[PDB]
Design a binder for this molecule. Sequence first.
Ligand SMILES: Nc1nc2c(ncn2[C@@H]2O[C@H](COP(=O)(O)OP(=O)(O)O)[C@@H](O)[C@H]2O)c(=O)[nH]1
Length: 271
Amino acid sequence: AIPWGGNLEEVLEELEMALLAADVGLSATEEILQEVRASGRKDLKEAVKEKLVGMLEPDATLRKLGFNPQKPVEPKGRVVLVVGVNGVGKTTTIAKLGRYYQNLGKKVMFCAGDTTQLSEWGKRLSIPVIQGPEGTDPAALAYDAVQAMKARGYDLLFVDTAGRLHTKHNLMEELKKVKRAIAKADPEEPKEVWLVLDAVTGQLEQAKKFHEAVGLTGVIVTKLDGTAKGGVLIPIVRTLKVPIKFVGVGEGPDDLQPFDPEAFVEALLED
Ligand SMILES: Nc1nc2c(ncn2[C@@H]2O[C@H](COP(=O)(O)OP(=O)(O)O)[C@@H](O)[C@H]2O)c(=O)[nH]1
């Protein structure tokens, strides 16, 4: 419980505790504390919320404007390239993404570009999966998938990718190839490139490599039902500078929640 209304120095000491306990981490926490003193506002809970919300929402034209007139997570286009290292919940996350968007009325397709599990999810969810024979070129596959999505009038295509980091072929170059192939099928695409990260392993070095290669537009952080306190989302967005799109909160297909930075911040600071 943080004493809003107590002495300036009392609020900050219990804020540091709350934030540190939440796994927001020393670097971000110190930043908030610095930011908060500076800003000589009487309403420090509202001031704290603004700084925490602020650092989760890194998305020029909006800077000039000062608000977003359109503000409900939805891909900006039809194709979402999903990237990440193996074992983070990439396949499962795609399955949950399909479920979530098909529950909203979208026609969703999957592309099995990790050349098993995805095909089976597609059957279960009644979602078509573009898939190929044992080791097919994932890039040629992604191109066929975008053409199939266009031709059959589908709204969303989720492209699964390899996540093995020290193989004979460079993972990042394979990704750029998939991304180039998608753009030959539809040059506006992929409008989303989404990194999947483990909460528990809330550790970002590799994550930056993903961004340099293919240009992230968002992150999905899985396993927020785990021992990692939810405050780890803060250093994730500070470091990556793309918003959290969804949070994974269990192993079943409905355990995916669109991220709400305002609800998150309110819950972070709750008594
Ligand atoms: N508890 C929990 N488990 C998850 C979550 N997301 C993924 N998993 C589990 O993580 C494991 C790895 O998932 P998988 O889809 O095979 O990961 P991939 O190798 O990254 O494609 C599976 O056992 C999933 O059940 C989550 O949000 N919560």
